[PDB]
Amino acid sequence: EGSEALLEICQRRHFLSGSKQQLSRDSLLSGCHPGFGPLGVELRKNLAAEWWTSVVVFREQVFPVDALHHKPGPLLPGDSAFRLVSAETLREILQDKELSKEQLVAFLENVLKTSGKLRENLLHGALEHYVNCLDLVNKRLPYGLAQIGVCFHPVFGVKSIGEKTEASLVWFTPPRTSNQWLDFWLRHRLQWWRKFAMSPSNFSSSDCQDEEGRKGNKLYYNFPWGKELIETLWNLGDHELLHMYPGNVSKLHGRDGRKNVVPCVLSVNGDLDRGMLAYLYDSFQLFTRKKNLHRKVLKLHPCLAPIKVALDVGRGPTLELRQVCQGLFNELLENGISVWPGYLETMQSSLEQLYSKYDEMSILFTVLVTETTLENGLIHLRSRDTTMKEMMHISKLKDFLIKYISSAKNV
Amino acid sequence: EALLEICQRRHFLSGSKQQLSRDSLLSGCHPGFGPLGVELRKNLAAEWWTSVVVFREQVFPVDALHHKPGPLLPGDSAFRLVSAETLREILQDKELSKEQLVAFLENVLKTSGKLRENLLHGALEHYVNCLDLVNKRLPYGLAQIGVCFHPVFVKSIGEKTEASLVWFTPPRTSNQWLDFWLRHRLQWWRKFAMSPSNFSSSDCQDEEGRKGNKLYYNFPWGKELIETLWNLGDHELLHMYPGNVSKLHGRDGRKNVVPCVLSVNGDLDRGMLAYLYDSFQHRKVLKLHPCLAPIKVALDVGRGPTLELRQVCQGLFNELLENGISVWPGYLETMQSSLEQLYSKYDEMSILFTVLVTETTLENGLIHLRSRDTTMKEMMHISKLKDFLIKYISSAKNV
Amino acid sequence: LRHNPLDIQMLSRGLHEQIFGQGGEMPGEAAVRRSVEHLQKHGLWGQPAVPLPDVELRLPPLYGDNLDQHFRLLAQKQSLPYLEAANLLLQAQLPPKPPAWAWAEGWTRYGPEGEAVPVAIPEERALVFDVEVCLAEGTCPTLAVAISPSAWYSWCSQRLVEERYSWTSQLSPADLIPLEVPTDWQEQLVVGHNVSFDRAHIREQYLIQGSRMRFLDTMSMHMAISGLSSFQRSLWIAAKISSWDWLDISSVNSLAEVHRLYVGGPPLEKEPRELFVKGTMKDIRENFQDLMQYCAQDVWATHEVFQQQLPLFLERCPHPVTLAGMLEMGVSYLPVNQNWERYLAEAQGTYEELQREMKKSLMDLANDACQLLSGERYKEDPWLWDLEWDLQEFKQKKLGPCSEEEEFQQDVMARACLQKLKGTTELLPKRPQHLPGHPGWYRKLCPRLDDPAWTPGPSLLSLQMRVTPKLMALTWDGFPLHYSERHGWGYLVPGRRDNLVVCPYRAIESLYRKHCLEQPSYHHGNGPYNDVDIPGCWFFKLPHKDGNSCNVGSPFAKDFLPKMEDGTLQAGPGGASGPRALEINKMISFWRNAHKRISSQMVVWLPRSALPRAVIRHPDYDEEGLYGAILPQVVTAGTITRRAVEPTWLTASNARPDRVGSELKAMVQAPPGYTLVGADVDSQELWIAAVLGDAHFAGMHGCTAFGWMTLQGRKSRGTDLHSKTATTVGISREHAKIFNYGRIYGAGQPFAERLLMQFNHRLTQQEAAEKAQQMYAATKGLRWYRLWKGGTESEMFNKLESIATSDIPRTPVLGCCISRALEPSAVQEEFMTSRVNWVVQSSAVDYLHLMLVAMKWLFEEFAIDGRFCISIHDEVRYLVREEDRYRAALALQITNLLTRCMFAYKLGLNDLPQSVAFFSAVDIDRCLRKEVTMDCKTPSNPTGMERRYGIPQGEALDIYQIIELTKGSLEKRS
DNA sequence: CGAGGTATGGCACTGGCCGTCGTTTT
DNA sequence: AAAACGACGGCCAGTGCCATAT
Ligand SMILES: Nc1ccn([C@H]2C[C@H](O)[C@@H](COP(=O)(O)OP(=O)(O)OP(=O)(O)O)O2)c(=O)n1
């Protein structure tokens, strides 16, 4: 199909990792793949930063939270989830005649009630820290907790565990505004997903119900093989809060205007791994003139592209060009622009091949310094979007890029 | 101690007072940090990343999974996952019970996985594939920051977030590359420390004869290991890829050689606590370095018409946020408590400056500004404020 | 009685006797025989119809001896004080301007000898008032000047004198001009030029409780006396089509031109720098004296204009009803709450979001286009080949190494090396060059770097740009689009081998041949305009809904949406790209056009202290909300017909499922404890024309076939004349309204058939033309009889023509005279269609005046606690107290009845058919909307008014339900 | 001899006139 | 060293087409 090329490119430029076999669709979706390469790590970091900026930075009632990766203590029986135990204790238990006849079959109950499990959702820690975070805003009822972290899920040795990077937000609100807040957050999250998308129509939403009859909204990305869930919204209500803090319900309330009412919980959970995959597929864009301009390139958003600038050297006196490129690279890093130091790479390919390599890596701009840059302050610039060359004075370069990215947010 | 009370009162540490303790924090089995602790740890990680990875062409990020499947070495100290699906099948048939259940323990090693003890193994696994990123230019590094699980003596589980750098270098200059790093890392800790003396370095010897260095911070109870550097040679690389060593070669001096591996591992939680103690050195104020303080400025309102002052404060809030300055919106309470108590609260939170918008700001734009360190009040034009703040940051970075 | 000689149900015995007397002369034998013959000729005779239920009511006393005298007395009672004040103004004697203007804030009165004294407010019965506002500072009024008999007044804004860093961005009643007297006498009159704008800046006008103060506009009186049509306005200017005697007696609405026309004298100088539009507050502060002097000059000019105008207006509209109608029409009022602000946000963001999806989709294409520059490949593109593929030149003047510790120098040595090289400003011009490398067409779409609103990429591109269709590779029936300078947009059909930077005709022929695989010209349409030189192709104009004369300005016009659905118009990328772009365009067109006006609406928020007690105690009251008002800036008479004119509220669209921001009118929400009660006149102008024809022909209702047909049928059964036409032709009822009214006012058969083909997609040219021909022949037959004579509506056309051809045309009902610039002596046979339509349109204006007078009289009669909310031509809406709302429901109905009888009285008919006796249904609601049932779903608010805002359904009640809820009474407690 | 009418306003484009500033003549 | 002599944007007004209402 047409999706083989995308995976091949992601493997060549180190977006993904591992062998071709390990990178099947099932492994990617489940989360049991080997992992991502450095470019994938940077892309995920950029996406996480954008999510944090859109969800946490510009709101007065949002705070971070950190939930551990395991659930210790007693658990309900029969869940059949993995358990945490140290190999140092795998022999001393049975040593010296500890009911060594048939009770070791009932030891499974011990396995059920002697070890914890791996964190499966970020919601539990947020519910635990609800009470602690209530003290920040003098119990002002509308307030949220946001987190990003890895979670473990069983997948069907015959079964394994898949790891998924997920971003979770829990919003405590007045019960009366629960549905309005649900609609508001649905619209806002859908807008955020569409913002970076080249084709924001491929993202879609749907309504959903279940046994409890609680309203829900779900967000899907249209991969070439079909719609895949990327984010969900649940209007849980207050059952979980009561169950975690039963009996003395009076402590659970918060201020809604002049009233003091029990909060309603709205939960949103997006998958950052699926988000990165969806954005890669969108960027690759899996019309007579379009077919005639089949350039392989990932049009990742400027706010999301792992690498911004590529810097190299032109033919001439190597020492002076190297010194000026060192200065330029240090300045670009100092202002806060990631740079690919191509000036340190040996010459083995022409300009066209280098441009192709940088396009596959999705680098916004290519900066070139030559003898003319010592003769005068002008350097060559090339833009990924247009492939058009330009001349620019070095002194202003730091500003221009800072403007470009800064304006990419508000296009 | 008073420091832990302040940390608990200002949402640096989570969990009930019954839970927080020195041993739990050191081991990593504590409930977790609060939002302020999370922000401080994020700032520390960002500073470390900028110092180590940003300004070097030969350092790259790496992603290592939190667990490793498949057969594993038996009889050791490390967390393992008990079979999950098997819990659904044994409850309908017994295999004769009795003394063949010992083999069940062996069956654990047949299927059970293991969590992540360190980032070194993941980096080593990546090494062969990632060497292609530098055209086999032997001297290069891989950096990562991640959580690791450690048994604590039923065994408890402690989680420690750590930053790891694996440096592959030619054997000849490796011993010189070690000391180099031993300097920079040691300098890095000193960069943000009000008392850089309390950070120290020591030389250590390995039973195999390989030397290394350990970085310690002097907490009031004693010197604690915050970071460690080990020179390991080619032992791990050979062990992980037994057989044909050809693929482990790298081009140094225009010839093939098997690199030596140096491991640098620093505990970011221990570093967090070390900086908390350092910055806490006749009032309870946490003088966290401006580059590390989670909250820069606090915004509030004076006595007067609420709507106008709230609009002005919201405009200033957006202006400060857009420039990368973290702001705590204290103007939603309208000074329901005394001003000195507010100053003390913000000092405990380690906020650099407190800005008070008053009715006179509508007339002329003058605003009251108080500093965390000098503690001297000033009148400034609001339009200036932003730029001034930025400078006060950048200057601190340079000096 | 009960039935007329033509078996048409009439007003019941009780109401008919209460309205008409027995003195009416029964029509003679000849008239009835002519009516019967006419009805038999058309097949309308011998068809009984079920009568509607009778209505029994006892109306309030009607003064005088008949309807006309009663209406005259009511209008005189309403309008006496304002006329007294105007007459007081006419005799005003004032000294010259003060030597120097005062600087204090507030109101200052200037006495003789130039002395200035502070006063709280002008203490006058009448004034000439003008306000100047600093636009850059928002909407808070800056200064003002007023003149009264024997006094000058100057008003200075507090923001003008004081210096503050910031001011409140939400308007309050505390920062507006105080221009009303607390509880000589009452009913002050305010005069000025464009008086609605001045009214908008009065603190007391926004109070929910009504005020006596009324306003007269010199512009409205100019329109009534010597107004000019839009065409006449355009032709009068540029005079610096075959008759020109009207120019010397008419002028445009600008104050200087009106002053010159009415008093002549030395011209009026302008302020050269336009500081109130361009300058800042400091400019006003420094140039205070000149600005105040110019304001005084304008006020004096307006005073002279009013003095010379009033007698002519009194002469040309002698009927007292017109003056009171204008006075009551000049006091529009709209309520709103905090939701309005949310609406402003909700639309704008939504707009942006859609505009982000659209531009993005275009921008990417632009980014992909630049590659065609390589190898000159653009020469092969059948769309972008004709663009500027320029290339401007940049312009100039004239090993195993070890680690190190010495890198501290390597750092600085590098940094300094850079710091030197950045000093090379020798060869760079002071004025930065603009993207020379990029092609010119791409450069045009990129904002300049120095622009404060700069964004990356070609962010300036939009659908309306002539390049956007080129980028999208739009196609029409397999033919690419093209733009001819003379003939607008069209498409290129390849194959012109007689030569009919050059066109790539091969790249078009190949594309069309490929397209044909999925199904001297050989195609039919607007025809080949050979003057457009494009070798290898013919150019065909895109069909326009208004005929071949017009040129298409954009393929993305809403009317082209069905063609996308059918697939005639396609996009090169395929899929939903083209349809999605057109859907976005249709969704956002209204907001794109009207957001500047809507967001800039002057909204004043009333503090809790000044709000009515009935709201502060209502159960549905909402604390922490906002309760403000908007006063529409209505020109009382901005047209020849004397209709009201305003930029915003006479153009606001009705709520629609897809149109973004269409819920504008829905945001006009009554405060808790208040309701909106209103109604629309059913088939107003059609009935007016029918009754005019009936009165002309035989003085009997229904004597003409058109009058017979208009009365029959019911709206609810879909059997009214509009619905009958809609079902006969197969379109919506609104399209039927347009189809009928076009023909009524002289629309040709080509217009009718083109309109039919626009809506009924089943029809072709043949069927539509045949339908139009038959309908026109039936409605009005031949126009000649000696080698309009026949047809159902012939008498109506003849009557309208006769009224228009009169040497001094007057309204048949109230007798208002047409503007001097259109009397036959001054225009002969020019502007004939406008003059003919003026009869009916001014009749509708008189209907509106009569309805307003009747509503005011009924509210005053029984101390009803309601007020006039707004009027849109025939639509009327009133804000009422909820407890009294039901009473209002009857007050409207009776008014309609009166307005129906009075109209007939002046026509010589002494009866009114039962069919048009009452409204179809009076609407009671919490917000303004076309119908109560609609919840107003929109992309701006998909959940509708019921969930997001909580507004429930309204209710429409006919006469019988109103009577039941009122028992026929109108007293406070029955 | 035959026309729909009355209003409002938006953006896109084009022609012309004017103020910088950097080549060219004194 | 003074100052013509031009190109090259800014800016405004005028025209055309489209979108709303009744
Ligand atoms: N396209 C239009 C719409 C309206 N009008 C004029 C004449 C109409 O009589 C008047 C009012 O039209 P409505 O929309 O109020 O229509 P009616 O009053 O005729 O119909 P209804 O029974 O729906 O009120 O506006 C017009 O000339 N052309």
Ligand SMILES: [Ca+2]
């Ligand atoms: Ca109507």
